[PDB]
RNA sequence: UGGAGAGUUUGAUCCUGGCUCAGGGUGAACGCUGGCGGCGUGCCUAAGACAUGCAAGUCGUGCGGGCCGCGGGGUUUUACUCCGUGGUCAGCGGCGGACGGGUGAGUAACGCGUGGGUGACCUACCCGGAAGAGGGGGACAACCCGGGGAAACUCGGGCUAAUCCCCCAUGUGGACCCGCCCCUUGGGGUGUGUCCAAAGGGCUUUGCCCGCUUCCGGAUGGGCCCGCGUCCCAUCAGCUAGUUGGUGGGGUAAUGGCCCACCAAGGCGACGACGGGUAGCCGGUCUGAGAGGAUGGCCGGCCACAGGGGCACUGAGACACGGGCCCCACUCCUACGGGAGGCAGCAGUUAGGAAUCUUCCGCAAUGGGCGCAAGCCUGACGGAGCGACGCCGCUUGGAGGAAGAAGCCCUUCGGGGUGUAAACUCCUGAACCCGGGACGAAACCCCCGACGAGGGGACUGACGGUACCGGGGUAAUAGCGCCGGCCAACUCCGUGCCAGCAGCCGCGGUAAUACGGAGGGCGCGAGCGUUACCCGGAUUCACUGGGCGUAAAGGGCGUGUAGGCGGCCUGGGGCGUCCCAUGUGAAAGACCACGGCUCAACCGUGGGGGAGCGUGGGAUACGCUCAGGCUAGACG
RNA sequence: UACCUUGAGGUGGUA
RNA sequence: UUUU
């Protein structure tokens, strides 16, 4: 028995737990940003989009997200924010959107 | 090269989607006789531009949905239910040739 | 990683290889990408090694790492000489 | 194995002199020489009209029973002859005439074909220098069929290559008696051979 | 460069028509028999169950330790402690573990095949090009301490290194939103805004090696989509709700009812939907004159599966055979709470079966993973073993030898046969013995040269003391089937519709070339027969290539739907059709030629053909379509 | 099992 | 009567 590959498993678990955590924030902030936008709170709705952006690319740094997966997220996010701010918004900090 | 096929539109009943009956011809692999087979393609009509009886070209395309992988390239000749008819009647013949019998 | 290695084609005790380009992960005697030569280790004929420096040079120029033996054979056939 | 056994009996069944003994088959004793009826308790009774089949069967036997080849090898050769270009019947005969054991016979290094065969399997023969012990070895044109020095001093080889002095040999061949060596010049042309066999019938035995 | 038929319905004949035989093939099996070698090949049945060993690791040149040991330091000595070094065990970290190997269960399907699409995509390691690597912070194993469990194994506390994790910076560059430009599905460019990099290590130590980060591209591998093609039953005819489409969203590398919410009411079918049966597909294999039929074992490609079912995690890549979780069945351990398993990997066991091998040698060669390298790992592989299972080669002797031994057989009792066969003489000399003894292996590495080119040097074979060479040397296995016709080979005796034969026709009821035996004969020969199965003959499902008055076969008749078919003349288009060019048609196999092993089987090299399909160009007689015309069909 | 009778049988006859 |  005993085939030291259980190691690969051990590691997978640590990695799993690391990815899991990273994605979780990305979601939380994304939602959060989407929420403030759908409320007209432009200055900070962007403020947070900026963080979400960072966290996404950052996740894509290693193998948590990686790929065009990162890009989709960034896309869909800016997509929903700029659009929701179509309620008088008027991008302030433009902390991410290029108007 | 993306495949290009021609056919008659035999169904409008869908949103942004037309059923194009494409007829095909060819020699029988063993009996020679040139036989004629056919197949219906569900092509994508974004601006619901085409109608029943429209001979149209169909172009191989990126999946628009399931069962739908062609867009209408253009309109060849308009109006001509003579074809839609053949089709419609053939479908109606099936009518009851089951436990009873279709209609002639 | 594509490679230039030998492929076994002789018969029991009558080995005959084929200098060949292929994806490192394929069976040694499997689907190769291109044959770029052959080689008879027992030199049963005055023609026991042929290459094709031109093609060898193409693949080399685009990755293709050669086995030590293949590298050897390639060299012997003037693949790397520059003089 | 290759038959081994009562041979001047095959001669009798085939009703013609097959030379499977060289000498004696010339003396007043080949049996075909006085006692021409087939072997066995029935050979003298009047024969019944043979079926076309019987003819070809007997005809194929006659031809094969001459070179001492096994039905197996005989068949394979004929198949090779068929597939090859040129008039099959012809090609077939030539191919048989190309067996080393046979050449060793045509050249006289040996009395009969069987004897010839043994001289080959026993290494007394050489081809282009290297010795060859394969009775079925096919000789190409230009090859030097010979005796190996180590064998040139054998009583049998002597009597044999001696009796060959002054004796002429097949036109598709050539022999240098003193050098105990000969050459396979050309594939014998059908006309060169004078076998008591109508090969057309053989081609037919194998068509059925 | 290719095509044979025969037996059998009758008193006889012609025809129809079925049955049967001759041929070829096989992963075979069975019987009698069995000498050598080479190359192949060997669970086709229970995808049944498996004891045991081996089958995937490697890296100290990423990192910090434990244990066992030696050496040298700081003292006057001790305690304590510093450095160097050997062995060893794992750990953290990395790359590999998604390849290689196995199987054919499932699957009638974009699974496979062939040709295309991807402006809808991904690709670790490898190659090319551009640019870069400043600063700071952190944790968890190991180890230490404590607790739980029968066990597997486990909970908590503390310390700690890094090529482990994070923050700031630099922004070649790249990503995202918006605009504009060129393109045209999500392709390429540009502007503002935002966001995003890095790891160190080794030294023949100021340079070079290994490596790290971001981007563009190459190369290889791959996902997805599409046209066409792919078995049987219609005694399966109607099927469908994520079901067909739409808008928005989720999801992925990416398109998509893939998934969801909402709306629409669609989609499919006799050109055979749906259901049932069977089945991995192919290159090819066998057969055939061909068309075609049958087949898919070995080898090569693709697919699918890994005790049955479901699931996701980690990753460039898996939904992962020797990784994980859950349910099920079974086995094992059990202090009864709970645990451990998964040979369709090599070999082997057992069960099933007519039937299918060695718990072998080696890592030397080719190939693969990791390593700078030495080198380690490799049941992949290269070899040997067993089985006539197949193919090819070889032997059991060669020459002489009586008008003819004996024995046995027949007999018109003269003789005939086995038979030159034996005996016997002479010759060669398979086995066996003695000696020699291999290619497959020259790289990696080291030295010179710049770790380059180039040159020099060293190590290394399981097979194998084998092949092969030389010397010596013995006459030294033959069997099986058949002999009425088809179908090659005939007599005696025994038996008496018995015993028996038998592929079809048939043979035996006291003269049997048909039963059993014997003599003799034919056939083939380490085989020969048998059984099963595929193609053939069978133009006997007829496309090539058949038929229907009485042989089997015209529907009881009409009306008519779909469909199939369509008179004469002209013109347009050019779909069918034909032509040219070009791409594709992997390797192996097949064919031709030459070549290597003494031959051959086997193998190497080279050559040639090739349907189908894609692309471009062309022709227009016939078919088709469109347009016009006609009157001979038809109708009035 | 036997003879009759058959070419040989069945039945049938004679023990 | 069965079989020739
Ligand atoms: Mg490891
Ligand atoms: Mg010929
Ligand atoms: Mg009759
Ligand atoms: Mg009769
Ligand atoms: Mg009559
Ligand atoms: Mg007949
Ligand atoms: Mg073998
Ligand atoms: Mg084997
Ligand atoms: Mg099996
Ligand atoms: Mg089994
Ligand atoms: Mg199993
Ligand atoms: Mg240590
Ligand atoms: Mg270690
Ligand atoms: Mg299967
Ligand atoms: Mg089905
Ligand atoms: Mg396809
Ligand atoms: Mg394809
Ligand atoms: Mg692709
Ligand atoms: Mg690079
Ligand atoms: Mg802790
Ligand atoms: Mg920049
Ligand atoms: Mg710039
Ligand atoms: Mg930054
Ligand atoms: Mg890092
Ligand atoms: Mg690519
Ligand atoms: Mg079906
Ligand atoms: Mg199956
Ligand atoms: Mg035929
Ligand atoms: Mg295969
Ligand atoms: Mg499973
Ligand atoms: Mg399972
Ligand atoms: Mg990886
Ligand atoms: Mg992942
Ligand atoms: Mg796995
Ligand atoms: Mg799994
Ligand atoms: Mg899988
Ligand atoms: Mg296993
Ligand atoms: Mg096994
Ligand atoms: Mg049994
Ligand atoms: Mg190795
Ligand atoms: Mg190696
Ligand atoms: Mg091991
Ligand atoms: Mg092997
Ligand atoms: Mg006698
Ligand atoms: Mg006598
Ligand atoms: Mg003799
Ligand atoms: Mg050498
Ligand atoms: Mg080595
Ligand atoms: Mg050098
Ligand atoms: Mg006869
Ligand atoms: Mg008889
Ligand atoms: Mg008698
Ligand atoms: Mg008989
Ligand atoms: Mg008899
Ligand atoms: Mg043989
Ligand atoms: Mg047949
Ligand atoms: Mg037929
Ligand atoms: Mg039939
Ligand atoms: Mg016909
Ligand atoms: Mg007929
Ligand atoms: Mg009648
Ligand atoms: Mg009738
Ligand atoms: Mg009628
Ligand atoms: Mg009737
Ligand atoms: Mg009609
Ligand atoms: Mg017409
Ligand atoms: Mg025209
Ligand atoms: Mg026209
Ligand atoms: Mg055309
Ligand atoms: Mg072509
Ligand atoms: Mg090919
Ligand atoms: Mg040769
Ligand atoms: Mg070839
Ligand atoms: Mg064209
Ligand atoms: Mg024209
Ligand atoms: Mg008209
Ligand atoms: Mg009687
Ligand atoms: Mg009778
Ligand atoms: Zn004679």
Curated annotation (Swiss-Prot), chain B:
Keywords: Ribonucleoprotein, Ribosomal protein, RNA-binding, rRNA-binding. One of its GO terms (cellular component) is cytosolic small ribosomal subunit. InterPro entries: NA-bd_OB-fold, Ribosomal_uS17, Ribosomal_uS17_bact/chlr, Ribosomal_uS17_CS. The keyword Ribosomal protein applies. GO terms for molecular function: rRNA binding; structural constituent of ribosome. It holds the Pfam family Ribosomal_S17. One of its GO terms (biological process) is translation. Belongs to the universal ribosomal protein uS17 family. NCBIfam families: PRK05610.1, uS17_bact. This is Small ribosomal subunit protein uS17.
Curated annotation (Swiss-Prot), chain C:
GO terms for biological process: translation. It comes from the Bacteria. One of its GO terms (cellular component) is small ribosomal subunit. The keyword Ribonucleoprotein applies. The keyword Transcription regulation does not apply. Coiled coil: none annotated. One of its GO terms (molecular function) is structural constituent of ribosome. Keywords: Ribonucleoprotein, Ribosomal protein, RNA-binding, rRNA-binding. Binds to the lower part of the body of the 30S subunit, where it stabilizes two of its domains. Part of the 30S ribosomal subunit. PANTHER family: 30S RIBOSOMAL PROTEIN S16, SMALL RIBOSOMAL SUBUNIT PROTEIN BS16M. Belongs to the bacterial ribosomal protein bS16 family. This is Small ribosomal subunit protein bS16. It comes from Thermus thermophilus. The lineage of its organism: Bacteria, Thermotogati, Deinococcota, Deinococci, Thermales.
Swiss-Prot record, chain D:
SUPFAM superfamilies: Alpha-L RNA-binding motif. Binds 1 zinc ion per subunit. In a number of structures (e.g. 4Y4O, 5FDV) a 4Fe-4S cluster is seen in place of the zinc cofactor. One of its GO terms (molecular function) is metal ion binding. GO terms for biological process: ribosomal small subunit biogenesis; translation. Keywords: Metal-binding, Ribonucleoprotein, Ribosomal protein, RNA-binding, rRNA-binding, Zinc. Its cofactor is Zn(2+); [4Fe-4S] cluster. Disulfide bonds: none annotated. InterPro entries: Ribosomal_uS4 (IPR022801), Ribosomal_uS4_bac-type (IPR005709), Ribosomal_uS4_CS (IPR018079), Ribosomal_uS4_N (IPR001912), S4_RNA-bd (IPR002942), S4_RNA-bd_sf (IPR036986). The keyword Transferase does not apply. GO terms for cellular component: small ribosomal subunit. Zn(2+) binds at residues 8, 11, 25, 30. CDD domains: S4 (cd00165). Residues 98-160 form the S4 RNA-binding domain. Part of the 30S ribosomal subunit. Contacts protein S5. The interaction surface between S4 and S5 is involved in control of translational fidelity. One of the primary rRNA binding proteins, it binds directly to 16S rRNA where it helps nucleate assembly of the body and platform of the 30S subunit. Binds mRNA in the 70S ribosome, positioning it for translation. HAMAP family: Ribosomal_uS4_B. Belongs to the universal ribosomal protein uS4 family. This is Small ribosomal subunit protein uS4. The gene is rpsD.
């Amino acid at each position: 028995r005993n085939l030291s590959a259980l190691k690969r498993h051990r590691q997978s678990l640590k990695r799993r737990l690391r990815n899991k955590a990273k994605k979780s924030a990305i979601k939380t902030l994304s939602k959060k940003a989407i929420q403030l936008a759908q409320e007209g709170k432009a200055e900070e709705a962007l403020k947070i989009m900026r963080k979400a952006e960072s966290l996404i690319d950052k996740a894509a740094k290693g193998s948590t997200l990686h790929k065009n997966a990162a890009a989709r997220r960034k896309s869909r996010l800016m997509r929903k924010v700029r659009q929701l701010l179509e309620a008088a918004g008027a991008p302030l900090i433009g902390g991410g959107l290029s108007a | 090269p993306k495949k290009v096929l021609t056919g008659v539109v035999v169904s409008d009943k869908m949103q942004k989607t037309v059923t194009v009956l494409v007829e095909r011809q060819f020699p029988h692999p063993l009996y020679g006789k040139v036989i004629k087979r056919s197949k219906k393609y569900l092509a994508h009509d974004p601006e619901e531009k085409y109608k029943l009886g429209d001979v149209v070209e169909i172009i191989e395309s990126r999946p628009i949905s399931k069962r739908k992988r062609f867009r209408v390239l253009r309109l060849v000749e308009s109006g001509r239910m003579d074809l839609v008819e053949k089709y419609l009647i053939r479908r109606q013949n099936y009518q009851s040739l089951s436990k009873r019998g279709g209609k002639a | 990683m594509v490679k230039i290695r030998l492929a076994r084609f002789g018969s029991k005790h009558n080995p005959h290889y084929r200098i060949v380009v292929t994806d490192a992960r394929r069976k040694r005697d499997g689907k190769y990408i291109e044959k770029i030569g052959y080689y008879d280790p027992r030199k049963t004929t005055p023609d026991w090694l042929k290459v094709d420096v031109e093609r060898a040079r193409y693949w080399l120029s685009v990755g293709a790492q050669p086995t030590d033996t293949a590298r050897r054979l390639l060299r012997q056939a003037g693949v790397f000489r520059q003089e | 194995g290759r038959y081994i056994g009562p041979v001047c009996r095959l001669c009798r069944r085939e009703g013609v002199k097959l030379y499977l003994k060289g000498e004696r088959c010339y003396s007043p004793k080949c049996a075909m020489e006085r006692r021409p009826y087939p072997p066995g308790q029935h050979g003298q009774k009047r024969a019944r009209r043979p079926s076309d089949y019987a003819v070809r069967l007997r005809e194929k036997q006659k031809l094969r029973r001459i070179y001492g080849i096994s039905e197996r090898q005989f068949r394979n050769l004929f198949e090779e002859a068929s597939k090859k270009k040129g008039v099959t019947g012809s090609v077939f005969l030539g191919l048989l005439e190309s067996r080393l054991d046979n050449v060793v016979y045509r050249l006289g290094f040996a009395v009969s074909r069987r004897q010839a065969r043994q001289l080959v399997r026993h290494g007394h023969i050489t081809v282009n220098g290297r010795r060859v012990d394969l009775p079925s070895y096919r000789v190409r044109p230009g090859d030097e069929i010979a005796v190996a020095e180590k064998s040139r001093n054998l009583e049998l080889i002597r009597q044999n290559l001696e009796a060959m002095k002054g004796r002429k040999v097949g036109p598709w061949l050539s022999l240098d008696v003193e050098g105990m060596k000969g050459k396979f010049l050309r594939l014998p042309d059908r006309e060169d051979l004078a076998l008591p066999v109508n090969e057309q019938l053989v081609i037919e035995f194998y068509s059925r």
